[PDB]
Design an enzyme around this catalytic site. Structure first.
Site, PDB file in Angstrom:
ATOM      1  N   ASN A 152      56.120  -0.030 114.808  1.00 52.34           N
ATOM      2  CA  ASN A 152      57.433   1.435 115.656  1.00 52.34           C
ATOM      3  C   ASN A 152      57.252   2.919 115.379  1.00 52.34           C
ATOM      4  O   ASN A 152      57.455   3.893 115.876  1.00 52.34           O
ATOM      5  CB  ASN A 152      58.619   1.354 115.466  1.00 52.34           C
ATOM      6  CG  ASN A 152      59.095  -0.557 115.710  1.00 52.34           C
ATOM      7  OD1 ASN A 152      58.476  -1.055 117.199  1.00 52.34           O
ATOM      8  ND2 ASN A 152      59.936  -0.976 115.322  1.00 52.34           N
ATOM      9  N   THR A 153      56.241   3.680 114.187  1.00 52.65           N
ATOM     10  CA  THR A 153      55.826   4.291 113.541  1.00 52.65           C
ATOM     11  C   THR A 153      53.580   4.330 113.777  1.00 52.65           C
ATOM     12  O   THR A 153      52.950   4.358 113.458  1.00 52.65           O
ATOM     13  CB  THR A 153      55.939   4.734 112.728  1.00 52.65           C
ATOM     14  OG1 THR A 153      56.968   4.958 112.058  1.00 52.65           O
ATOM     15  CG2 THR A 153      55.089   6.652 112.300  1.00 52.65           C
ATOM     16  N   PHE A 204      62.327   4.137 112.903  1.00 52.60           N
ATOM     17  CA  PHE A 204      62.533   5.229 111.486  1.00 52.60           C
ATOM     18  C   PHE A 204      63.830   5.930 112.041  1.00 52.60           C
ATOM     19  O   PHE A 204      63.907   6.856 111.903  1.00 52.60           O
ATOM     20  CB  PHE A 204      61.859   5.978 110.611  1.00 52.60           C
ATOM     21  CG  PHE A 204      61.063   5.157 110.009  1.00 52.60           C
ATOM     22  CD1 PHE A 204      60.870   3.809 109.618  1.00 52.60           C
ATOM     23  CD2 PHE A 204      59.422   5.486 109.781  1.00 52.60           C
ATOM     24  CE1 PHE A 204      59.900   3.031 109.132  1.00 52.60           C
ATOM     25  CE2 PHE A 204      58.939   4.171 108.805  1.00 52.60           C
ATOM     26  CZ  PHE A 204      58.548   3.331 108.301  1.00 52.60           C
ATOM     27  N   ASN A 228      56.093  -7.302 107.396  1.00 55.81           N
ATOM     28  CA  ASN A 228      56.759  -6.847 108.739  1.00 55.81           C
ATOM     29  C   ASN A 228      56.436  -7.876 109.470  1.00 55.81           C
ATOM     30  O   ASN A 228      56.706  -8.666 109.615  1.00 55.81           O
ATOM     31  CB  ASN A 228      56.490  -5.436 108.083  1.00 55.81           C
ATOM     32  CG  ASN A 228      57.944  -4.428 108.587  1.00 55.81           C
ATOM     33  OD1 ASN A 228      58.653  -4.655 109.658  1.00 55.81           O
ATOM     34  ND2 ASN A 228      57.650  -3.196 107.854  1.00 55.81           N
ATOM     35  N   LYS A 265      55.373  -2.851 101.631  1.00 53.46           N
ATOM     36  CA  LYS A 265      55.514  -3.969 102.407  1.00 53.46           C
ATOM     37  C   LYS A 265      54.489  -4.072 103.537  1.00 53.46           C
ATOM     38  O   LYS A 265      54.327  -2.680 103.885  1.00 53.46           O
ATOM     39  CB  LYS A 265      56.690  -3.675 103.250  1.00 53.46           C
ATOM     40  CG  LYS A 265      57.092  -4.342 103.812  1.00 53.46           C
ATOM     41  CD  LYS A 265      58.818  -4.319 104.349  1.00 53.46           C
ATOM     42  CE  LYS A 265      59.008  -5.421 105.666  1.00 53.46           C
ATOM     43  NZ  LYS A 265      60.892  -5.632 105.785  1.00 53.46           N
ATOM     44  N   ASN A 323      62.853  -4.780 117.868  1.00 53.05           N
ATOM     45  CA  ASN A 323      63.143  -3.647 117.484  1.00 53.05           C
ATOM     46  C   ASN A 323      62.283  -2.600 117.686  1.00 53.05           C
ATOM     47  O   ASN A 323      60.698  -3.069 117.470  1.00 53.05           O
ATOM     48  CB  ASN A 323      63.571  -3.716 116.599  1.00 53.05           C
ATOM     49  CG  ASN A 323      62.999  -3.560 115.397  1.00 53.05           C
ATOM     50  OD1 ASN A 323      63.074  -2.185 114.439  1.00 53.05           O
ATOM     51  ND2 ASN A 323      62.509  -4.585 114.944  1.00 53.05           N
ATOM     52  N   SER A 342      55.509  -1.031 109.600  1.00 52.86           N
ATOM     53  CA  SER A 342      56.058  -0.395 110.901  1.00 52.86           C
ATOM     54  C   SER A 342      55.323  -0.700 111.685  1.00 52.86           C
ATOM     55  O   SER A 342      54.107   0.344 111.552  1.00 52.86           O
ATOM     56  CB  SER A 342      57.314   0.354 110.147  1.00 52.86           C
ATOM     57  OG  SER A 342      58.009   0.625 111.514  1.00 52.86           O
TER      58      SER A 342
HETATM   59  C1  LIG Z   1      66.413  -3.227 114.176  1.00 57.56           C
HETATM   60  C2  LIG Z   1      65.387  -4.489 112.584  1.00 57.56           C
HETATM   61  C3  LIG Z   1      65.532  -2.567 112.448  1.00 57.56           C
HETATM   62  C4  LIG Z   1      63.918  -3.160 110.898  1.00 57.56           C
HETATM   63  N1  LIG Z   1      64.193  -1.903 110.290  1.00 57.56           N
HETATM   64  C5  LIG Z   1      62.981  -2.189 109.010  1.00 57.56           C
HETATM   65  C6  LIG Z   1      63.098  -0.578 107.934  1.00 57.56           C
HETATM   66  O1  LIG Z   1      63.297  -0.302 107.927  1.00 57.56           O
HETATM   67  N2  LIG Z   1      61.525  -1.114 107.142  1.00 57.56           N
HETATM   68  C7  LIG Z   1      61.062  -2.331 106.632  1.00 57.56           C
HETATM   69  O2  LIG Z   1      60.669  -2.220 106.156  1.00 57.56           O
HETATM   70  N3  LIG Z   1      61.881  -2.896 107.664  1.00 57.56           N
HETATM   71  C8  LIG Z   1      62.114  -3.074 108.964  1.00 57.56           C
HETATM   72  N4  LIG Z   1      62.879  -4.243 109.618  1.00 57.56           N
HETATM   73  C9  LIG Z   1      61.561  -5.298 109.211  1.00 57.56           C
HETATM   74  C10 LIG Z   1      62.178  -6.034 108.271  1.00 57.56           C
HETATM   75  O3  LIG Z   1      63.346  -5.860 106.825  1.00 57.56           O
HETATM   76  C11 LIG Z   1      61.978  -7.775 108.037  1.00 57.56           C
HETATM   77  O4  LIG Z   1      60.947  -7.349 107.386  1.00 57.56           O
HETATM   78  C12 LIG Z   1      61.952  -8.470 109.661  1.00 57.56           C
HETATM   79  O5  LIG Z   1      63.316  -8.439 110.746  1.00 57.56           O
HETATM   80  C13 LIG Z   1      61.248  -9.751 108.897  1.00 57.56           C
HETATM   81  O6  LIG Z   1      62.760 -10.433 108.481  1.00 57.56           O
HETATM   82  P1  LIG Z   1      63.989 -11.690 109.128  1.00 57.56           P
HETATM   83  O7  LIG Z   1      62.190 -12.845 110.033  1.00 57.56           O
HETATM   84  O8  LIG Z   1      63.858 -12.648 108.376  1.00 57.56           O
HETATM   85  O9  LIG Z   1      64.404 -11.021 110.569  1.00 57.56           O
HETATM   86  C14 LIG Z   1      63.544  -4.278 110.496  1.00 57.56           C
HETATM   87  C15 LIG Z   1      63.489  -4.640 111.553  1.00 57.56           C
HETATM   88  C16 LIG Z   1      64.670  -5.556 112.201  1.00 57.56           C
HETATM   89  C17 LIG Z   1      64.885  -6.553 112.885  1.00 57.56           C
HETATM   90  O1  LIG Z   2      62.716   1.251 111.938  1.00 54.10           O
HETATM   91  C1  LIG Z   2      61.841   0.561 112.993  1.00 54.10           C
HETATM   92  O2  LIG Z   2      61.746   0.646 113.993  1.00 54.10           O
HETATM   93  C2  LIG Z   2      60.924  -0.570 112.079  1.00 54.10           C
HETATM   94  C3  LIG Z   2      60.212  -0.529 110.403  1.00 54.10           C
HETATM   95  C4  LIG Z   2      59.696  -1.047 110.414  1.00 54.10           C
HETATM   96  O3  LIG Z   2      59.674  -1.508 109.272  1.00 54.10           O
HETATM   97  N1  LIG Z   2      59.832  -2.245 111.113  1.00 54.10           N
HETATM   98  C5  LIG Z   2      60.336  -2.792 112.217  1.00 54.10           C
HETATM   99  O4  LIG Z   2      60.377  -3.733 112.608  1.00 54.10           O
HETATM  100  N2  LIG Z   2      61.144  -1.322 112.533  1.00 54.10           N
END
Ligand SMILES: Cc1cc2nc3c(=O)[nH]c(=O)nc-3n(C[C@H](O)[C@H](O)[C@H](O)COP(=O)(O)O)c2cc1C
Ligand SMILES: O=C(O)c1cc(=O)[nH]c(=O)[nH]1
Ligand SMILES: CCOC(=O)c1[nH]cc(Cc2ccc(C(F)(F)F)c3ncoc23)c1C
Length: 376
Positions: A192-193, A123, A268, A239, A119, A190
């Protein structure tokens, strides 16, 4: 039973899930999920969670060890429905002071055969003010609902795209929503920032943590107060990103110990997975099964580098009960899911709790707390 009654493992949601994973855009499926939850169409898990699988981080008492990671309900639009699927807590956000649309779409893509996601959302959220109003409404419903009395809600906070100094954005969010959060998660990970992960440098990270802790302490002075589950001021978690060298991780551990941070979320998404043919083209961070081993090893390192003094929230490639036990024995006290809900649907919480309970029994553990860090 999938067919006999309406419940998280209802067969039709699995039929839907197969259709969604094959034909529908990733972000569109997620929006549909949230819409069903917003209108309370999704099924409930009303089962008693095993007393032997409960866990805690300081005064946070998790009824079970599985929650939903940040980024699933960015704006807190269906906190109730997600929790009622069987989860003990949810991390809403990440939120920014003002709303922003994020990067261009499509920005979320899945690789089903590897159970992985990439992804580049950037944010995307409605803004601190609106998400605060969404959380307040949940807190009011929670006080009346006997199914949610002990459920935990954390808030992940970041910065807007054009914010120079991140602390300014963090302080704003804390003063607006901190009173309604059980804990605050500082997102400096993150991918992506651009430049956000630079804030994991020891000097900047210490200043950020201490600034966040002071602002939470200032909420008490400036202002019934804690309209959250704990009735206490929110805990502070950080995080962390998995793409770090050992020296980076060691200096981060020293900072976390020096600042008395309450916990660390590991971890993350990663930018270091180029194994997925279908992701060749794509930018962003990778989630899912390809992140599991990376994240578990990261847990082991920080658990040792912090001398087991900082509780760990596990995130990364957790799908099965065995996966969860791996995280726990590596040093984690609680687990977060995301990709699991994407690839296994509404039964994710009920299924993984049953698998973990049957595993703690098979392995001879009296309870989950006994398994924390047993790999060491
Ligand atoms: C589409 C998407 C959006 C995410 N947005 C955030 C986010 O806004 N803030 C954050 O700390 N992590 C974000 N994450 C990371 C997840 O919280 C998690 O740390 C990561 O997906 C690993 O867990 P998993 O393997 O079970 O998916 C995002 C992940 C995905 C796939
Ligand atoms: O908002 C996002 O693009 C984002 C944030 C984050 O913390 N981790 C991630 O995978 N995507
Ligand atoms: C990248 C993240 O986005 C996603 O792909 C995603 N998010 C959540 C899910 C899971 C899910 C979504 C919608 C439904 C439906 F059909 F009921 F609406 C589901 N039924 C069973 O699981 C469903 C998915 C696939």
């Amino acid at each position: 039973d999938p067919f006999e009654s309406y419940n998280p493992e209802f067969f039709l949601y699995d039929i839907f899930l197969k259709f969604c994973l094959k034909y529908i855009d990733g972000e569109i499926c997620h929006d549909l999920f949230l819409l069903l939850g917003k209108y309370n169409i999704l099924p409930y898990d009303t089962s008693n969670d095993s007393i032997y699988a409960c866990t805690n981080i300081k005064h946070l008492d998790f009824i079970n060890p599985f929650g939903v990671a940040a980024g699933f309900d960015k704006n807190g639009v269906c906190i109730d429905s997600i929790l009622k699927l069987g989860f003990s807590f949810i991390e809403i956000g990440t939120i920014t002071p003002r709303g922003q649309t994020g990067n261009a779409k499509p920005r979320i893509f899945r690789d089903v055969e590897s159970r992985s996601i990439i992804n580049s959302c950037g944010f995307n959220n409605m803004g601190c003010d609106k998400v605060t109003e969404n959380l307040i409404l949940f807190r009011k419903r929670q006080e009346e609902d006997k199914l949610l009395s002990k459920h935990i809600v954390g808030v992940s906070i970041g910065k807007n795209k054009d914010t120079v100094n991140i602390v300014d954005d963090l302080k704003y969010c804390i003063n607006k929503i901190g009173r309604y959060a059980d804990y605050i998660a500082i997102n400096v990970s993150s991918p992506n920032t651009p430049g956000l992960r630079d804030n994991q440098e020891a000097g900047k990270l210490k200043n950020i943590i201490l600034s966040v802790k002071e602002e939470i302490d200032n909420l008490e002075k400036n202002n019934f107060l804690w309209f959250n589950t704990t009735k206490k001021k929110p805990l502070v978690f950080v995080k962390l990103a998995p793409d770090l060298n050992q020296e980076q991780k060691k200096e981060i551990a020293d900072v976390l110990l020096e600042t008395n941070i309450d916990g660390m979320i590991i971890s993350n998404t990663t930018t270091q997975i180029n194994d997925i043919k279908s992701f060749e083209n794509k930018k962003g961070g990778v989630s899912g099964a390809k992140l599991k081993d990376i994240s578990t090893k990261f847990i082991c390192e920080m658990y040792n580098y912090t001398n087991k003094q900082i509780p760990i929230i596990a995130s990364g490639g957790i799908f099965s009960g065995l996966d969860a036990l791996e995280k726990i024995e590596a040093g984690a006290s609680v687990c977060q899911l995301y990709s699991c809900l994407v690839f296994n649907g509404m039964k994710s919480a009920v299924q993984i709790k049953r698998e973990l309970n049957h595993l703690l029994y098979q392995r001879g553990y009296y309870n989950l707390k006994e398994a924390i860090g047993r790999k060491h």
